[PDB]
Design a protein around this ligand. Structure first.
Ligand SMILES: [Mg+2]
Ligand SMILES: [Mg+2]
Ligand SMILES: [Mg+2]
Ligand SMILES: [Mg+2]
Lengths: 719, 719
């Protein structure tokens, strides 16, 4: 629900269980009053006013020294109000002046959910959602700012976006543009963020917010491996199952900045949006710029509920793929299995092997195009290497189909190698600075996807390939960060170009399952999930590391979105050995699939694959649609444990991987969550019956281990 | 409810919201299965068995090395089972052997609540409570142990006691006897205990339970200032408003020991009961010994609910005084007002002064008997000093009644000074060791209250005094710890004697309001609250320190039980100055009352007294009967804040004392608890209206302070 009280100039946004409230003050400033548990009260009483030294006053406040935007909580604070905190907006006007001082002009409440020009965004129908659009302006800056709030009641989600219009005659530049700001007049908080590196993404870091700023972001041209564009502000003491917490999630696959600051008056400001670095975005007279969307959510009852709200929002209101509500083929991917050393014949052998085990699809990964026999050439040359494939791609697809198998293929359309026909023809199509030798990464360069001519060339090549046969799946990879950034519009316009290509591809091939990828989870974001129902979660396929990566990824993203494959051991990234069973349990927390040559496996491991596939298919709907619960913290605990629970709470699958081993082992219990306390549940394998209360308070004792890194799955059915 | 399953030999105790379960195993041992959230399951599945090195086996386990009482969870573990953890019971038999190895014999379930011979205990009617009595025995020790469990469903309380019988022919000694043991097979816990000193009792100490034992107790002959006989075992992460926590509270005013231990297998054992030090209790053939009661409780939703369960249990099922459900006279006490320097005339002047302010009662404190003109003589000589009083006590009482005032008096019956007629006549009546000069404390000695002849002499003297007129109130003090303990039965039998005297006194004078005291809160325990509806909380009457003392005291004990008086400044114990208003707000969290000479006050402070009394009387029922909530932690926070809420949640009184002051003050909010989220509440003084949700999530901003240690009271009424 969205309500306006014209007398108090208060806007209230209600979800099923939350309330967000803002007010236009007598000077025209849009103040933030409240976000938290549902209330019908007017929360303007929380505002207080004192003469605070060096916190100065708008001219319009006259002699009232107690009114300062350096103290008051705001919806969209800006550089140019006298506020000295981190700010959401900085405009450099047509005379070089950095100032924006925004006053209320008008509003509209609309049924349904706004869409964003050229960008992914949350979507919903006119019954499920409402939109508030508030117009603010600064007549000296000659800017008009449209704040967009999307309210999805059942999901307990409030989205925010911004459109900025130049209303003057000369060009302005947008120098900083956040999508969302939360100002808290009180509270002690921790900041949860998800940091990592290539092949070890999204480790949880949780620290108290001390005085000053905790900040993180990306200027890599991508959302990044290093810091995901996501933040949780948890009230001190909040746990998985109790206490207030707030999320912001950026629906965006490019650069970003997140800032959380505890100020001089013990107030907290949380910002998320575009990075101000390499962002000086020109806006001509009368033109509008759109800031990508942030999904906000609040939980009064801990982190697990907050995550569940995000999972549901992403599955049902971000992902547009038909595969959200369909079985997804269990695939085998050629990359760890063969790297570049394959032929058409060895792809068909992989299909034969995989077919005999119950695998549904073979994915021919990197190495099939140009003269790509290593990673030093051929990106941009998306012509099938028929020498290597021993014939045409059409013939290969048919040979695979004849083994009863679907076919998928890898592409990397944003990239070019110096050693390519494309680069020899068009060296100026690479992102570079004139006169400067560019950074190389994986011995390749980015194509300038801000340029239509560049995108069109590559799009046409990819269409020729995809039109050769029935290709049910594409893995779209992206294997380096952007450098040599030549202008202040490039980072943003590059990503517009990526999304344009992706939209064109998905529209042309609406039955295609598109798996996003960027050296693993280098663009693991809701922007990509708008197009792809799954993203390769990490290049690290070590089961033990995957417990951490998948744990961290679950704070915002649904299990269904996490690409996860059983791979060979010793693991190619770590050298560690894990049992085949443990690899299977860990990879079932995601898409499932395989990425190895099954011909090298023992007959016992081949039979495990057969049984694994049967297990995953049996539980696929539960894993993908069920309510997810983290049952342990793999950074600190003896086990990595999680579970999925059906909507009716009549079925649950519990997964456990042991992380630590000593002699004379203590008994370890796994405590379940999300069941009906008074219901009786049958554990399938053992045939024992337990109340939900018992399972949640005492849990179940794990069988004693006899080897390292042992794993377990337990299924429960309500009687 | 109490249930027996004969086939599984499982006993289940259900309260409204909790379940406690135990089992007799195939060898006859009484194992503890579960205590926590309500469940109908059989929790015996939580038991596990492994061959654990050096954890040995009863002979009766035969060749099964996996069965050990050094590992298994037990209701009442003992020295002599092969268990090496802290234990609940140690018996030294008629041959000198320390061993007790207890096996199940029989049980009974009874409606109603058991009583204890010569001891205070929880009481209830046959509809409100049930009792389980389990009989265990050791035929070699020749001991029979009766475990008593009392179940009070509505209160979510389970009580435990023990009766130990010598079934052999020779004398045994009881060397350790706990009342309660909780064994946890899993969980990470913190231990909350309440430590202090004279004039600074019951500071909260909360630490994680590391491997090893956290222990505390008293061998002072008293429950003590230093460590209260109370413990909370909180699951890691438990807060005031969420998470599992367990209480044990000893209904006993003598020696005790509490031990919490995290063992070699990451299990936790919590014990509370009698101290094993100075405890070697002889039991002749056929005789029974009773261990004092422990009140257990569990909360799944944080510490505040746990405390509320205790408050209700104590008010409605421990305290027997009629004053639990009646207005209590607002009193003025002569001690800080005059110390020993008073006459009958100055007591009547105090009555006159107090009457003009709306005070109901004058309490003549220490100094009225023998030649007690200081604390160096006369304890034991309970004859009125008619020289000092300028006449008889009967005449003094009448003179006070003529001023419209009730009368109260102080006694200290357990004590004797060497300089007394009683000591000159009966020096052997003091507790002492033959041939040894005794410890002196406050230049006095304990009388041996284990001796009937001693008690009878003093009881008769006190009766003569109380029979002189209408004395509505007695403050029974006790101003030193027990030393020179001459035998192993003395600590226990002394306290039996105290309770016998107290029972006789209360039975003879059933309309008397008896306030317990022991240099303040030196016996602030549920044993005393059985007889007294209030206990002088501390000799420290400094308002700022009282915020901490009262906070700590509230973890187990109701506000109504806390004696609290407005006293003069600079404070007599600290030298600190506080405003009269702040003293008033702090002392209203308790009995209220005054302890100063009002003749020395300004007319403005006299008028404050008039208004304070009107305020306390207006809110007396709410403060005493309402649900109590700690709203801040005075050890860490900017404020000491608390509130009381009516049962219907239609009325609340919020109290705040500021603790910290700096320039350019930040706005401090007090967040309320325990209201109805959707209800609308009117704040009385301001006339502003708020939803419960608003008040609990955002709270209310405190008015800015202009002086140090400022206090506030806010009243809310549901519209
Ligand atoms: Mg910039
Ligand atoms: Mg920055
Ligand atoms: Mg002993
Ligand atoms: Mg001890």
């Amino acid at each position: 629900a969205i309500i306006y009280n014209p007398n108090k100039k208060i806007f209230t946004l209600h979800t099923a269980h939350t309330t967000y409230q803002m007010q236009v003050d007598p000077l025209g400033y849009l103040l933030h009053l409240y976000y938290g548990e549902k209330t019908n009260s007017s929360m303007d009483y929380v505002l207080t006013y004192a003469d605070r030294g060096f916190s100065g006053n708008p001219y319009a406040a006259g002699m009232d020294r107690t009114y300062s935007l350096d103290a008051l909580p705001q919806e969209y604070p800006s550089l140019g109000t006298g506020d000295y905190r981190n700010i959401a907006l900085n405009i450099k006007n047509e005379k070089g002046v950095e100032s924006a001082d925004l006053l209320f002009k008008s509003y509209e409440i609309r049924n349904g959910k706004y869409r964003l020009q050229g960008l992914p965004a949350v979507w919903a129908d006119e019954k499920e959602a409402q939109t508030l659009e508030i117009v603010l302006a600064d007549e000296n800056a000659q800017v008009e700012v449209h704040l967009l709030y999307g309210v999805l009641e059942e999901n307990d989600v409030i989205t925010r976006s911004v459109r900025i219009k130049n209303t003057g005659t000369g060009q302005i530049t947008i120098e900083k543009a956040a999508a969302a700001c939360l100002d808290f007049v009180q509270g002690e908080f921790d900041v949860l963020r998800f940091y990592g590196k290539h092949a070890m993404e999204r480790n949880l870091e949780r620290t108290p917010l001390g005085h000053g700023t905790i900040a993180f972001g990306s200027r890599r041209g991508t959302s990044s491996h290093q810091y995901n564009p996501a933040v949780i502000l948890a009230e001190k003491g909040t746990t998985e199952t109790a206490g207030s917490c707030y999320g912001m999630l950026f629906v965006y696959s490019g650069n970003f900045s997140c800032e959380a600051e505890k100020d001089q008056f013990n107030q907290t400001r949380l910002l998320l949006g575009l990075n101000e670095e390499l962002f000086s975005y020109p806006l001509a007279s009368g033109e509008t710029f759109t800031v990508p969307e942030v999904i906000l959510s609040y939980s009064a009852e801990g982190l697990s509920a907050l995550s569940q709200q995000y999972h549901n929002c992403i599955r049902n209101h971000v992902c547009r793929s038909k595969y959200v509500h369909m079985q997804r083929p269990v695939l085998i991917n050629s990359w760890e299995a063969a790297y570049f050393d394959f032929t058409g014949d060895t792809i068909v052998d992989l299909a034969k092997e995989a077919a005999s085990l119950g695998i549904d699809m073979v994915v021919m990964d990197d190495g099939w195009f140009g003269k790509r026999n290593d990673d030093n050439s051929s990106l941009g040359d998306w012509q099938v290497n028929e020498t290597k494939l021993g014939g045409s791609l059409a013939e290969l697809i048919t040979r695979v189909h004849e083994q009863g198998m679907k076919f998928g293929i890898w592409i990397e359309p944003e990239m070019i190698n110096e050693d390519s026909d494309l680069y020899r023809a068009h060296p100026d199509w690479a992102i570079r600075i004139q006169g400067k030798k560019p950074v190389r990464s994986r011995n390749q360069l980015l194509l300038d996807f801000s340029r239509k001519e560049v995108r069109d060339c590559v799009f046409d090549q990819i269409c020729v390939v995809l039109d050769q046969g029935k290709i049910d799946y594409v893995k779209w990879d992206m294997n380096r960060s952007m450098a040599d950034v030549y202008a202040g519009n490039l980072s943003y316009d590059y990503v517009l170009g990526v999304y344009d290509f992706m939209e064109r591809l998905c529209s042309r091939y609406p039955d295609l399952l598109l798996e996003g990828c960027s050296g693993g989870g280098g663009r693991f974001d809701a922007g990509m999930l708008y197009y792809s129902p799954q993203i390769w979660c990490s290049d690290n396929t070590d089961a033990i590391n995957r417990t951490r990566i998948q744990y961290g990824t679950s704070f915002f993203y649904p299990v269904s979105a996490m690409g996860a494959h059983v791979s060979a051991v010793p693991n190619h990234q770590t050298g560690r050995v894990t049992s085949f069973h443990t690899r299977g349990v860990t990879a079932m927390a995601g898409t499932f699939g395989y990425e190895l040559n099954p011909a090298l496996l023992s007959d016992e491991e081949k039979q495990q694959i057969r049984e694994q596939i049967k297990t995953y298919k049996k539980y696929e709907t539960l894993i993908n649609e069920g309510t997810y619960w983290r049952l342990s913290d793999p950074f600190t605990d003896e086990i990595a444990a999680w579970m999925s629970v059906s909507e009716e709470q009549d079925h649950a699958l519990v997964s456990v991987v042991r992380l630590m081993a000593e002699a004379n082992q203590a008994t370890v219990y796994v405590r379940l969550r999300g069941l009906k306390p008074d219901a009786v549940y049958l554990e399938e394998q053992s045939g024992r019956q337990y109340s939900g209360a018992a399972l949640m308070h005492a849990g179940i004792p794990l069988p004693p281990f006899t080897e390292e890194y042992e794993a377990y799955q337990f299924a429960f059915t309500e009687l």
